[PDB]
Design a protein around this ligand. Sequence first.
Ligand code: HEM
Ligand code: HEM
Ligand SMILES: O=[N+]([O-])c1cccc2c(Br)n[nH]c12
Ligand SMILES: O=[N+]([O-])c1cccc2c(Br)n[nH]c12
Ligand SMILES: O=[N+]([O-])c1cccc2c(Br)n[nH]c12
Ligand SMILES: O=[N+]([O-])c1cccc2c(Br)n[nH]c12
Ligand SMILES: [Zn+2]
Lengths: 400, 400
Amino acid sequence: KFPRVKNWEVGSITYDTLSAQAQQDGPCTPRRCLGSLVFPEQLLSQARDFINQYYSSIKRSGSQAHEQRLQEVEAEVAATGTYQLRESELVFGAKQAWRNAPRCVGRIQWGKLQVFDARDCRSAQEMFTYICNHIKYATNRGNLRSAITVFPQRCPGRGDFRIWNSQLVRYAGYRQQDGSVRGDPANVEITELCIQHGWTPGNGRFDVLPLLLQAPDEPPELFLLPPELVLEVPLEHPTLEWFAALGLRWYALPAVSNMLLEIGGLEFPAAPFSGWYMSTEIGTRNLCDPHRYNILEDVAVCMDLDTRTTSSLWKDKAAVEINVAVLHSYQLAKVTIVDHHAATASFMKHLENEQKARGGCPADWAWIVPPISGSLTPVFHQEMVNYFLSPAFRYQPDPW
Amino acid sequence: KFPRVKNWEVGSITYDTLSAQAQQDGPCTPRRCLGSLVFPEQLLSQARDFINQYYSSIKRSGSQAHEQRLQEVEAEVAATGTYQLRESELVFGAKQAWRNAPRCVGRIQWGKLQVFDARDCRSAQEMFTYICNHIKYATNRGNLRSAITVFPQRCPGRGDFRIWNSQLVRYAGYRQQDGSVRGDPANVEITELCIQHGWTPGNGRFDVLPLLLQAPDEPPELFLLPPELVLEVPLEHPTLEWFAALGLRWYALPAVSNMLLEIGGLEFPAAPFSGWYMSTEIGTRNLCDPHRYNILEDVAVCMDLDTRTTSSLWKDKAAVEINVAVLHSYQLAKVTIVDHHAATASFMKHLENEQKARGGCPADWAWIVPPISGSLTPVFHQEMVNYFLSPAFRYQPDPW
Ligand code: HEM
Ligand code: HEM
Ligand SMILES: O=[N+]([O-])c1cccc2c(Br)n[nH]c12
Ligand SMILES: O=[N+]([O-])c1cccc2c(Br)n[nH]c12
Ligand SMILES: O=[N+]([O-])c1cccc2c(Br)n[nH]c12
Ligand SMILES: O=[N+]([O-])c1cccc2c(Br)n[nH]c12
Ligand SMILES: [Zn+2]
C-alpha cells in the first residue's frame, strides 16, 4: 500500500510511492515505534542500484554506456573485492546523499552542492590542506557556499582516513575541578583527546579546537586552524545593550566531519560537508540546551524576569531573545544565516518539488520541526514519512 | 531484544519491556516510519487479557474468583456474543485507557479519575442530563477534577450511542460570504450540522455550540448547555493593557467526546472524558494555528512589532505573550491550568513511575513535546517508544 501523507493546515493530500523503493530497514516495527531514537554479492547489489540511479538521472538508462559501466563494476569487484567511482558519479552520489538526509530541513538547496574530489589524498598533511581549502571556499568571507570534500574510500587491508572531530569548527570543553565545564560540554571528550595528543589547552569559553586528522594505519596528528580561516560572529542584541557584554559568540561555518558517506556500497569514512546555520541551532540548542552552555537562566535574570515561577514563561521569553540576537549578530556581521520560519517554509517547497520529482521525500518530523515555536512553522502541521535511502550520510562509531 | 530508550540531557538509559506485550499493531514497518501520522475468537482473547489485568491490580491473580470471572465472561460470550462488565472493572478499565494514551502528557493523574457509569441510559434526553452533571462535577467552580461518563456499549442488534460534537464545549464556526470564518474554523462542519438540525445560529466569535446527542437508531437531537454550566475565562495580559480589549476568551473544561472507549473487547462509542487545560493548547494551538483563530499577526501589530521580516521573530514573540495571557487569565479567574514546563516536568516523573510499575510507558514524542519552546522542556531530550495497549481510547469515524 502507499502511505497517505496529509497536511492538516491546508488539508492537502499526497502519497509516498518513494518509500516502497527504500532499501535498508529501520528500528520501527508494527509492534512498536522507535522513530524518536537518535541512533561481495551484497556490495554488487548496491553498486548496480547506484549505477542505475546515475544513468537514470542523465536520461540514458538502458544505453550501451549504462551496460558497459555495470559490467565494468562487476569485473572490478571480482578482481579486487571493491571498485572505484567516476568523478561524475561521485558528484551525483554526494548530492543524492544530502537529498536523502531525513533530518535536514535545508535540502531545497541540494542541487547546488559543490563537490570537491579529494580521493587522491596521500596523508594527513594533504588532508589538512584540503580541509583548509574547503573552509576558505565555503566561508567565502561571509557569503557561505555549501560544499563537501570526499577523501579516499574504505579499502580492504588498511585503515581508513578519519576526522576525529565531530565538526571542523568546535569549541573546547574543559572539565572543571568543581564538576562544572568551562566552554562547550558537548566537546569534552574530543578536547581531552586533543590535550593527550600534545595540544596546549586554553581556559576560555570559546577556544577553537585543533583538528585531529588520521591517515590510514597511522595515529592522529594535531593540526592548528589558522584563526584567519575560522570566521566568527560576536553576539549582541538590537535593544538589549548589555548583551554584547556577555562575550558570547559562535562560528560561521557548520561543518560535519564525523559522518560516513555511503555511495553504491562504497564507504567514505571521511567526507566533511557544510552549508550554513539555521539560527535556532545556535540560539536554542547550542546556547540553551541544559547539557550545553545553559545560558538561559543567566539571560533571564539579566532581562530582569521573574525566574521564581514557570508561569511567567521566562524561559520562553529569554530563549526568543537569544535567538533574535543570533539572527541580528549574523546579519550585522554579514554572515549567511536563516531563521526557522524561512527555513521551514522553504522545506515545504522542497516537499512539493520532491513529490513531482520522485513522488515523495524521506523526512524525520522530530528533526524537521524546530526546537522552538514548533506549531508556528508549516512543517509541524505536515505529516511526514521517514525512511532510509542510498546514497546517504550515516553515523559511525568514534575512531578511538 | 527490548528497545533501549535514552535521555540525552542526563544520559540515563532504560529498556521498555512493556512494549513486548502490545495487544495490537501500529502503522510503522521496518521499511518506513509513519509515526507523525495523526490517523468472537478475537473478543474472548482481549476480554481474557483484560480480566487478567484486573485481577493483577487487586493482587488476586489466579484465585477462584479470577477463574470464575473468566468462565462467566466466556459463558456470556458463548450465549450472547458479548458480555457485561462488573462496575469495578469499568472503573479500572477507564483508568487504564487514560494510562495507556500515548499522546496524553498529563497521565501522572491517571489514578485520580472520577467515573460515571451511565450504561443504563436509554434516551438522548437522559444522555444530556448525564453530561450536564458531568460538567458540573468536573468544573467544580474552578478547581477541575478529571472525569468520564460511560454510556451503553456497542450492541450487535442496534445502533450506537453517539456524541456528534468533538468536545462537550466548543465554539461555533460561521462561514461568512466573503470566504472568511467567524468563530472557530475547526468547527465549521459540526456548526452547520446543528443549523441543519433545527438550531438558530448566533453571530459571535465564541458561541458555545449545542450538543448533538444520538440515541440508538434515531436521528440526533439538539441540546443547549445552560450558560451557568459552562465556565469561561476572559483573556487579559499582565502588562499589555490592550489585550483584554480584544474580547478574547476560552472555556475552562476540555472534554473529548468523539472517541471510542475500548475495554476487554467491548466498545463504548460514547464515553466523554475531561481533565484540565495545558496553556499551550489554548494559547498556541487554538489561538495561533493558521487554520484556527489565527490571531498572531494582529497581536504582533498591536505589540508594535515589525512584521515585515520573519527574522525579527515577531511570530515567536507574539506567541509567547499570548500564552502568558492565557496562564495569567486562568490564574486570575482561579481556573485550573498548567503551563507546558510544569506539565512536561510531571510527565518525566510519570515515566520514572511507570518504569518501576510496568517496566515502560507508551508515548508519542510528537504529541508529548509542547507546540512551542519544545527543547526548553525535558521531554524533548527524552527518547520514547510508541505502541498500542488496551484498555484504550481510539478514534472512530464521524456518526454522519
Ligand atoms: C543549506 C544549509 C543547511 C541548513 C540550513 C541545514 C540545516 C540542518 C538542520 C537544522 C539540521 C538538524 C539539526 C542537526 O542535525 O544538527 C540538519 C541536519 C543534517 N543535515 Fe542539513 N543543513 C544544511 C546543509 C547541509 C548539507 C550541505 C548537508 C550535506 C551535504 C547536510 C546534511 C545533513 C545531515 C546529514 C544532517 C543530520 C546529521 C546531524 O545530526 O548533524 N546539511 N541540517
Ligand atoms: C488532567 C489534565 C489533562 C491534561 C493537562 C492533558 C493534556 C493533554 C494534551 C496536551 C494532549 C495533546 C493534545 C491533543 O491531543 O488534543 C492530550 C491528549 C490526550 N489525552 Fe490528556 N490531558 C489531561 C487529562 C486527560 C484525561 C482525564 C484523559 C482520559 C480519561 C485524557 C486522555 C487523552 C487522550 C485519549 C489524548 C489523545 C487526544 C486526541 O485524540 O486528540 N487526558 N492530553
Ligand atoms: O544549520 N544547522 O542547524 C545545521 C545542522 C547540522 C548540519 C548542518 C550543515 Br552541514 N549546515 N548547517 C547545519
Ligand atoms: O504530524 N502532523 O501532521 C501533525 C499535525 C497536527 C498536529 C500534530 C501534533 Br500535536 N503532532 N503531529 C501533528
Ligand atoms: O489540557 N490539554 O491540553 C488537553 C488537551 C486534550 C485533551 C485534554 C483533556 Br481530556 N484534558 N486536558 C486536555
Ligand atoms: O533527544 N531525543 O529524544 C530527541 C528525539 C527526537 C529529536 C531530537 C532532536 Br532534534 N534532539 N533530540 C531529540
Ligand atoms: Zn515509527
